[PDB]
Design a protein around this ligand. Structure first.
Ligand SMILES: CNCc1cc([N+](=O)[O-])ccc1Cl
Length: 330
């Protein structure tokens, strides 16, 4: 089996991407944020505290003939941005782009934090990190990918995110028309439950490549690129007037600037992020200070190759017995 679904930016800045997912019988279609940095499939639902729902489409398990309460199971998750959600659990049929899993754990939110409430376009998350991070208690549950894997033609999924445009998540096959050149594969550590790998270095604009190991995670659920302070300082030093603002919460730059590209290494290969991908626009409406798409990971505790980096590549999440990550230019 295979699946193929289009993923669409939620706004003009590519703050996140949503992908339609069919849950239950008859199908209830919810738009979920596919998140390779977490391992819970959770949804706004008929159980979500009413005051915490503002425009989202909800899953109603009582209207699904295939829904079953997973008795006694609860879940609770906190994300790196300080947001959170929690609730109870149903099993139901879940389909993504024509690929169907029966008996998938669908985590029904009873509570969500304010940033979820405020994002009317995101009806929940579909986690694609390793199932060891799943928060369901007392019986940990598997991700959609882990449940699908045995049925897939090949034990892989791919992320092909667009810059200010739709893109694609494929399951079970590599679309050889979706990238240019060859795919470079690199080792993954699953020790922390993430798609964790080591970049071989970086360059700023047309500058020389600095060979240096940068351990980080491939995280489709994080908007920006978070790298060590040394690397980030070297980047923003090339932008006149750029500075780190404690009041804003990161590097800002004059909206009149032309940003340099940023290159990261994957083995002996190189992925180039165009300067425009690093522009996240005015910090507040009408401001001439613009927010940067490359930020320091100091204080996070991990480097994060989020959408700014991933959307510059065709990315293979290889879930074979020894997992690996592949990157190609596109
Ligand atoms: C865990 N990956 C990043 C993240 C993703 C989301 N998401 O809605 O997809 C929310 C918070 C964070 Cl910190």
């Amino acid at each position: 089996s295979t699946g193929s679904a289009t993923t669409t930016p939620i706004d003009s800045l590519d703050d996140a991407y949503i992908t339609p997912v069919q849950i239950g019988t008859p199908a209830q279609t919810l738009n979920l944020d596919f998140d390779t940095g977490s391992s819970d499939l959770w949804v706004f639902s008929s159980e979500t505290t009413a005051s915490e729902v503002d425009g989202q489409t909800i899953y109603t398990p009582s209207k699904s003939t295939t829904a079953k309460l997973l008795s006694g199971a609860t879940w609770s998750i906190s994300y790196g941005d300080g947001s959170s959600s929690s609730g109870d659990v149903y099993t139901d049929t879940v389909s993504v782009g024509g690929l169907t899993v029966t008996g998938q754990a669908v985590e029904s939110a009873k509570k969500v934090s304010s940033s979820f409430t405020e994002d009317s376009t995101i009806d929940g998350l579909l986690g694609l990190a390793f199932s060891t991070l799943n928060t369901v208690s007392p019986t940990q549950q598997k991700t959609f990918f882990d449940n699908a894997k045995a049925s897939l033609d090949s034990p892989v999924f791919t992320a092909d995110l667009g810059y200010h445009a739709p893109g694609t998540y494929n399951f079970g096959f590599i679309d050889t028309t979706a990238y240019t050149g060859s795919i470079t594969y690199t080792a993954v550590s699953t020790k922390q439950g993430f798609w964790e790998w080591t970049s071989t270095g970086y360059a700023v604009g047309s500058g020389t490549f600095k060979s240096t190991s940068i351990d980080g995670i491939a995280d489709t659920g994080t908007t920006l690129l978070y790298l060590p302070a040394t690397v980030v300082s070297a980047y923003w030093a090339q932008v006149s007037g750029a500075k780190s603002s404690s009041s804003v919460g990161g590097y800002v730059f004059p909206c009149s600037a032309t940003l340099p590209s940023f290159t990261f290494g994957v083995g002996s290969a190189r992925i180039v992020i165009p300067g425009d991908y690093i522009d996240f626009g005015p910090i507040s409406t009408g401001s001439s200070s613009c927010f940067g798409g490359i930020q320091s990971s100091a204080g996070i505790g991990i480097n994060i190759f989020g959408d700014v980096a991933l959307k510059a590549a065709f990315v293979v999440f290889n879930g074979a017995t020894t997992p690996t990550l592949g990157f190609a230019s596109k």
